[PDB]
């Protein structure tokens, strides 16, 4: 029951739709979206 | 300096893309899986 946060934007699990965990890091759906725009190379 | 994806451990030379945030990195392969997760539920 610990508060977990996205390692990229700092938002908590209670502020995002989804939080994905790596070994010792986390990323939320919003940041995954930003990464998509970058990898897609368009806005 | 050699950088590694914080999520899968692969070096930048093993992936196509590597994006970084504050003391954290993620590659295209992990981003791809994250999309599957988000589009899954």
């Amino acid at each position: 029951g610990k508060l977990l946060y996205c390692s990229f934007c700092g938002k908590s699990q209670h502020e995002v739709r989804k939080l994905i965990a790596g070994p010792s890091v986390y990323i939320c759906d919003e940041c995954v979206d930003l990464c998509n725009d970058i990898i897609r190379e368009e806005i | 300096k050699l950088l590694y994806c914080s999520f899968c451990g692969k070096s930048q030379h093993e992936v196509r893309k590597l994006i970084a945030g504050p003391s954290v990195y993620i590659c295209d392969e992990c981003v791809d899986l994250c999309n599957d997760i988000i589009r899954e539920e």
């Binding site: 940041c31 970058i38 | 950088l3 196509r16 893309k17 590597l18 994006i19 970084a20």
Partner: peptide
């Protein structure tokens, strides 16, 4: 903020 490493 995000940055492109590669």
């Amino acid at each position: 903020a995000l940055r492109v490493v590669k």
